[PDB]
Every structure is written in structure tokens, then in C-alpha cells.
């Protein structure tokens, strides 16, 4: 029989397998440290992998999870959960409740208490299947009192060919106990990458030899007549970056030669007190955080409290993360002193999981995968569900949206459906009330409202045209069980007002290319709204000469669609959110420059925005009971200050069509933090043009993150199938 690589490409429309393989088995083959740039550049030197890419599913980049290391990425693929949820946050970590440390070279690696979640072999055992695992992280640990059917304790002295032959011999096991799920792991090209760097000759040799191993496996598969039955997933966990010895940062220069702290070095450095667990909580982290706050111009690191990191990282829920963290620029690392660190002139990984050099590999082959296709970028945390659809299993709950990755399968198993609203929207009717005085003195150039009833009473055609113009994709729905909201309609912006918290939840509007922005002043001018009862928070007196709080407008009054002045109805009482003094700079700069720039460049944008409340830094919206206690008190009144602000922008893919009639959608979402000061960006003698844009750049997110953190559901009226909508919502903006 000739080598499998020499055969012409074919198609597998129906699997033919011996008895016992009604559902074809799945193989999970991993190459440590193999980054996507390797296949981008040296593909001509790798025949087998290139052929596998040509005759199967392929993606240019697969995004790992933060931190970008071995166990987090190798255990999130099988569990499907974020590192903050399945426990293993890094190769080195400390648990104070256990008062223990986790390490690769110690005996604590096999302690079952370190592992949480639920792997895939556990599910297979529960639902009547057998699995043979060969050197997968976490497989040789008694998780939930269950072992895989066949497993091997890790040992790095075993040659690769013995592993491959053992897998084949398991494949020739009789059907009585034949496994249905296999894995296989190799240590290269990671070791050569560390020793010699991403760009060298030893890495080329390692790539060619692992390709030879893959070809050996494929030839063994073909010799057994299983080359058209098995499902193959060629995967990788991270990438590699070249570290220099002149690109380190030492904390002894700033923090002195102190000897009561410990630092976890690398591109994901962290700080911990030395006295544990007694001083784990009583320690003063904020002092050190403010100590190193941009002590030098353009320093290539940034301190961060673990609850102030960007929400796209998901690195704050667990208690094994130290309350302080350092965000490092590309190619840079951090340490305390030159003694407490590893070598400097070698390759490294572990940086932010959005850098171009940290992306992984994903290739699919077999009857269940499409042929000669190329998909977009997706996270590894969604492979789990895919595997569950390749073995006919019901997945355990995880952090992947089922059906999002459904276009990679010939015959989809699961059909996603849109979530339904819990309760119908209440209505806020007009009620006669006395004309109270709010004590506000503003510019007389603003035209006051004469009759509230007259202008806000509209014929059904008016509401129809306003709904068409302002909500092209339909109103967002609410999934919270106990939350009473009413829909407020205006001339060019639509709002959802919540009676429970006394604040708008979402405001939606559209900005056209020809729309103009005014520049007049509109301060300390508030117009009362009769549709809701008055509140002492809704007066200018509360915000008059206050150094703690302030107010902002969700719908920008600078935008008028009919006149060159300012919009009067945007100054209503029901369009006010509490805001800090410093955040107003970012808000005003955005609404004044960036909105206009986006509208001009993209030919109109549909904008919907609001506040989000999350005091648990867990990624999910707080309940009413939890939200009740967290409200602050000031001036003998009770307020509830937002934690972050979300804004999302929608337009057409092609610039020749207005957002009202988009054939395809292009979306951009941001979740910005609400901080008292701007010490995060370290503005000092710097023009305002750049830092606000950079802050908006760093804090991007996906629509799924916004849905999780708000409890809202978007785009429920589009004619596209639910799978396409789920795929679009999971897309994370790239620049």
C-alpha cells in the first residue's frame, strides 16, 4: 500500500466502518507550541499537514485563553469552561484555603482537589462510552471518583513512535471494550522553541519531524482501512514569542530591596505577600498599585487590580488569582530581581491572548467535517460542544454557545433557538402631575416644551415609522425573571426605563451620514417628564456643586436630525445616568468626535448603549436582592452608581447601503469601566486625542459578553437563521 499522502484528494460522504462503530470515533491530537504562523509560512515544507488542511476544515487562527499556557489551555478544551471556572489558572498557583501550592515538578499535580468542572471522558462514561487517553493534562487524576478506561501516567522518556503504536493497538482492540475517544500529545515544537527561538533551523527540523509522525499515524490508519471512518482534530494550545535579555522589568528599582513579597514572573506576572495565609487578605495592595503607577514615560507594564482588568479576559472570579496583576506589552516580561527568574535570551509565551503571535492551530478531517473549507477565528472553549456533536452526547453546561460553530459540520445535530422573554413589557402611561420647579437655570436659546400631552401623542403611523427608523433589528429583550420595565418612545431615540432601579437600561438610536453635531452649551438644564413619578435624584439641586457624582445623557443632545441647534427632548428627566467627573471627558470626546467619524466613514451607524452593574466581578448581571445592598448613600439620599457602560454599534458590511437595509451586519461593541480617576491611562501633559481612543481600543468585547453582563438579547427580528446570528454574536472585533 502506497503512502496516504500520495493518494489524490477524495470525499467521504458516508462512513463505512466495521461492527461497533455506528458512531465514528474521535481522535484529539495535540502538538505543543505549534503556532499558526508556522503553517502560514513554512507550509511548503510540510506536505502531510498541508494535505490535511486542503482536504478538510481549516481556520487561520484559533484564540487561546488567558493566561496562554499549558494546563489552562489543555483543560479548557476538554472542560469547555474558562480558567476562572475550572480551577487550573496557571502552571504555578497557590490556594490559601488548602494552604497549598500547585507545580509541574511536585506531587501536588495529582491532587484531585485542584481540578474542577467536568471533562469529556466523564461525560462519555456517564452516557455509555469508553475512552482511551494518552498523556493529556488532568487525565491521570481521579476527577469526581472516575478514571478514563485506559490511561497512562505522564512520563517524558517514552518515544513518540511507541505512543502512536499504542494508540493503533488500542484501535485494534475488540469491540467489547474498544474506546470511542482517543487523545495523543507531543512535546514539540515547544521545547525547540524555548531553546532556540521561534525563527531558527532546529524549529524547522522539529516541524518536519512532527509532520513525519503525523504521516506515520495517517499511514497506520490507512493500512487498517479506517482512513475513511475516524474523525481527526489536529489542535494546538498556544504560540511562541522571542524574548530578549534587554526587555525585562525589575521591581527592585521601584519597590526597593524589600524582602516580604513574592512575584510570579513572566509576561503574566503577579504579586503576593510572603506571609500566607494570615496576610493574604489584610495586605495593602493599593499602596503598591499606586506606587508603580507610570513612574516613567511610556513604561511597558501596567499594574491592575484583578477586578479592573478588561472584561474580555475573564480572570477575576476565582480566589487563586492574586489581587494584583501586571499587564505587559508585547515581547516584554517582568521580574523582581535578576536572581528570581529564568533565562532571558529564549522563547516565551503567556502574554495576552489577542496578540498575533499567540494564536493556535485547528484542522479537522473525516466524515463529519466539510471538505475544502476555511472558517473564521473562534475560541478553543467551543471545541467541546463540537466534540459532543461528533459523538451524539448531551454536553454539560459550559461557556460556549451551542450552535455557534455549527457551520463546520456536514449534518448538524443541534438546532439553536432564540431565547424567549420572561414577562411582557409593562407600559408607562401619562398621568397628570403638578408642574414642579427643578431649580435649573440654563441657556435661554433652548426651546422649552409647551404641552407634554400634545407633542407626545402620536397616530399609529407615527409609532410605526419611528419603530422602523430607530429599531431596524427589533427592540432588545430582557431575560431577567423579576424586572419590570416600560418602553419609552421619542422622536429619534427609544429607551427602556426600569421602575425597580429608577434608571434607563438601554437607549437605541441611529446616526446618519448627513447628520450634524452642535456645539452649544446645555449644562444644568433639566426638563421634567410626567410619565414617571418625580424623584429627588432627578433635580439639578442634587448635582449642583457636587464633587462626588454627576449626570450624563445616554442619547446625545448634540445630535439634531431636523435643525442645526440641539434636541430639546433629549434633555428629559428619563435620560439621565449617574456619572463621575473624570468619565465625562471620555463620554464627551466619544460622542463629539468618534460617533461623527464612524458615521461619516461607515455611512450611518445604529447605536444602542446603557449601564451595567456587576459588583461581584463574576461576569454575570447582579440580581435585585444583591443589587439592593450595594447602593450608596449621599446627601441623605440613596443612589446606585453604575459599574461599567456598554455601547454597541451596527452597520452594513458594504458602505453603499444604509443601516436600515443591511444585507449583512458589521458590529462593534465596547464595555468601558466607570472609574473615579484616569490613572489607568496615565494622562499627563498629553493631548486628549490618543488616550481615549486607546482606552476604547483595549476594552472591546463581544456581543455575547454584553448579553451575559446585561441580561439583554439583541437581533431577534432578522430573517437569517439562528446559527448565523449566533456566529455573528461570537465574533470579537479585530484591528
Amino acid at each position, epitope marked *: 500500500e502506497k503512502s496516504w499522502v500520495e493518494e489524490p484528494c477524495e470525499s467521504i460522504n458516508e462512513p463505512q466502518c466495521p461492527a461497533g462503530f455506528e458512531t465514528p470515533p474521535t481522535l484529539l491530537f495535540s502538538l505543543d507550541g505549534f503556532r499558526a504562523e508556522y503553517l502560514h509560512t513554512w507550509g511548503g515544507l510540510l506536505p502531510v499537514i498541508s494535505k490535511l488542511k486542503k482536504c478538510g476544515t481549516y481556520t487561520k487562527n484559533m484564540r487561546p485563553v488567558y493566561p496562554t499556557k499549558a494546563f489552562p489551555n489543555h483543560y479548557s478544551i476538554v472542560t469547555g469552561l474558562y480558567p476562572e471556572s475550572h480551577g487550573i489558572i496557571d502552571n504555578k498557583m497557590y490556594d490559601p484555603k488548602m494552604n497549598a501550592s500547585f507545580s509541574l515538578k511536585s506531587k501536588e499535580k495529582f491532587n484531585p482537589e485542584w481540578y474542577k468542572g467536568e471533562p469529556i471522558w466523564v461525560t462519555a462514561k456517564y452516557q455509555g462510552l469508553k475512552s482511551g487517553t494518552f498523556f493529556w493534562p488532568g487525565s491521570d487524576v481521579e476527577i469526581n471518583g472516575i478514571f478514563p478506561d485506559i490511561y497512562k501516567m505522564y512520563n517524558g522518556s517514552v*518515544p513518540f513512535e511507541e505512543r502512536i503504536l499504542a494508540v493503533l493497538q488500542w484501535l485494534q482492540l475488540p469491540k467489547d471494550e474498544r474506546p470511542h475517544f482517543y487523545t495523543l500529545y507531543l512535546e514539540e515544537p515547544d521545547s525547540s522553541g524555548h531553546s*532556540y527561538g521561534p525563527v531558527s533551523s532546529e524549529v524547522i527540523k522539529a516541524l518536519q519531524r512532527v509532520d513525519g509522525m503525523v504521516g506515520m499515524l495517517m499511514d497506520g490508519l490507512k493500512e487498517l482501512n479506517l482512513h475513511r471512518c475516524l474523525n481527526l482534530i489536529l489542535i494546538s494550545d498556544h504560540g511562541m514569542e522571542q524574548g530578549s535579555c534587554k526587555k525585562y522589568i525589575y521591581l527592585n528599582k521601584y519597590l526597593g530591596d524589600v524582602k516580604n513579597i513574592k512575584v510570579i514572573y513572566g509576561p503574566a506576572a503577579r504579586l503576593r505577600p510572603s506571609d500566607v495565609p494570615d496576610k493574604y487578605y489584610s495586605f495593602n495592595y493599593e499602596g503598591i498599585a499606586r506606587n508603580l503607577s507610570c513612574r516613567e514615560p511610556n513604561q511597558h507594564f501596567k499594574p491592575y487590580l484583578k477586578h479592573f482588568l478588561p472584561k474580555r479576559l475573564h480572570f477575576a472570579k476565582s480566589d487563586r488569582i492574586e489581587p494584583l496583576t501586571f499587564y505587559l506589552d508585547p515581547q516584554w516580561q517582568l521580574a523582581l530581581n535578576p536572581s528570581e527568574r529564568k*533565562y532571558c535570551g529564549s522563547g516565551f509565551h503567556g502574554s495576552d491572548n489577542v496578540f498575533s503571535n499567540m494564536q493556535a492551530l485547528f484542522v479537522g478531517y473525516g466524515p463529519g467535517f466539510k471538505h475544502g473549507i476555511e472558517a473564521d477565528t473562534f475560541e478553543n472553549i467551543e471545541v467541546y460542544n463540537l466534540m459532543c456533536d461528533l459523538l451524539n452526547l448531551t454536553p454539560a453546561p459550559n461557556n460556549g454557545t451551542h450552535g455557534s460553530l455549527n457551520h463546520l459540520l456536514k449534518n448538524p445535530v443541534y438546532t439553536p433557538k432564540h431565547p424567549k422573554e420572561v414577562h411582557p413589557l409593562v407600559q408607562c402611561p401619562f398621568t397628570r402631575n403638578p408642574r414642579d420647579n427643578l431649580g435649573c437655570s440654563c441657556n435661554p436659546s433652548i426651546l422649552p416644551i409647551e404641552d407634554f400631552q400634545t407633542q407626545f401623542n402620536l397616530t399609529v403611523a407615527e409609532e410605526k415609522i419611528i419603530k422602523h427608523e430607530t429599531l431596524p433589528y427589533g427592540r432588545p429583550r430582557v431575560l431577567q425573571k423579576e424586572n419590570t420595565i416600560c418602553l419609552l418612545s421619542q422622536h429619534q431615540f427609544m429607551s427602556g426605563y426600569s421602575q425597580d432601579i429608577l434608571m434607563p437600561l438601554w437607549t437605541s438610536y441611529t446616526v446618519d451620514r448627513n447628520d450634524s453635531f452642535s456645539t452649544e452649551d446645555f449644562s444644568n438644564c433639566l426638563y421634567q417628564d410626567f410619565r414617571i413619578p418625580l424623584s429627588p435624584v432627578h433635580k439639578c439641586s442634587f448635582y449642583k456643586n457636587n464633587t462626588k457624582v454627576s449626570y450624563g445623557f445616554l442619547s446625545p443632545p448634540q445630535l439634531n436630525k431636523n435643525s442645526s441647534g440641539i434636541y430639546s427632548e433629549a434633555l428629559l428627566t428619563t435620560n439621565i445616568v449617574p456619572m463621575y467627573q473624570s468619565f465625562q471627558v471620555i463620554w464627551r470626546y466619544f460622542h463629539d468626535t468618534l460617533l461623527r467619524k464612524y458615521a461619516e466613514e461607515r455611512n450611518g451607524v445604529n447605536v444602542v448603549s446603557g449601564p451595567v452593574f456587576d459588583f461581584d466581578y463574576d461576569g454575570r448581571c447582579d440580581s435585585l436582592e444583591n443589587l439592593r445592598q450595594k447602593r450608596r448613600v449621599i446627601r441623605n439620599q440613596e443612589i446606585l452608581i453604575p459599574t461599567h457602560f456598554f455601547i454597541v454599534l451596527t452597520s452594513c458590511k458594504d458602505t453603499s447601503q444604509t443601516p436600515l437595509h443591511c444585507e449583512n451586519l458589521d458590529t462593534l461593541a465596547f464595555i468601558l469601566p466607570h472609574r473615579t480617576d484616569n490613572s489607568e491611562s496615565c494622562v499627563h501633559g498629553k493631548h486628549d486625542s490618543s488616550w481615549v481612543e486607546e482606552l476604547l481600543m483595549l476594552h472591546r468585547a463581544r456581543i455575547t459578553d454584553v448579553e451575559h453582563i446585561t441580561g439583554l438579547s439583541f437581533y431577534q427580528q432578522r430573517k437569517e437563521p439562528v446559527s448565523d446570528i449566533l456566529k455573528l454574536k461570537t465574533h470579537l472585533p479585530t484591528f
Partner: nanobody
Amino acid sequence: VQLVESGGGLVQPGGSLRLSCAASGFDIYYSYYIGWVRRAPGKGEELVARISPSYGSTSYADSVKGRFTISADISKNTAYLQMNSLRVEDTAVYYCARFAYPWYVADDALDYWGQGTLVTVSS
């Protein structure tokens, strides 16, 4: 890639030496083993000590058991071999050796050799 040895010389019996081996071009942490090999006239290659830089486990010859001490500094990529209470036959030339991984069978047992330092003991 190269390995350099330092600390050699001539000492009276009962003295103490601390040979140092510095490697460049690769990483000590990501190496299978780091060892010392001594050669004396009338004798062939002999393994006296070897260490695993990551695990820290050490392997010693019977002739030097209880007399030598091997260690590794990772932040500086160095291997240290301290020898005390030297004997008359301990005079020899020493090499710093790096072993290869057993991942591929068609590979040599060792990969690289150092320049080697000559040590003599006399009254």
C-alpha cells in the same frame, strides 16, 4: 552553541575545587540532563555526576558517591560541580556534557561536548 569550563587548576591532596560550566546557544532548563565526564590516562569515558535541571534529581557514580556535589543555576545557565577531599587518581580532564532526549530513537546518546579542563593533584 558552546560550553565553557572554568575553575581548574593544581591542588594538593585533600583540597577543594568548584568547577563551573557555562552554556550558550541553548537553555539549561529545557535540556534532558547536564553531566560531567572525566578522562584519565589508561581509562575511557566515565560518568561521575549528572543532574536534571528542572526536576533537581541527581545521579552519581559509586567511586565519587559522598564526595561530589552537583547543582544548577537556571537564571545564569550554569552547572556547578564541587569536589572535596580529592584523591591521587582524581587527576584527569573534565568535559561538560548535555544529553539528548529519547523522543527519537535515531539520535545520539549525547549531543555536545565542552572544551574540557585539566586538573592535577600532587604532593
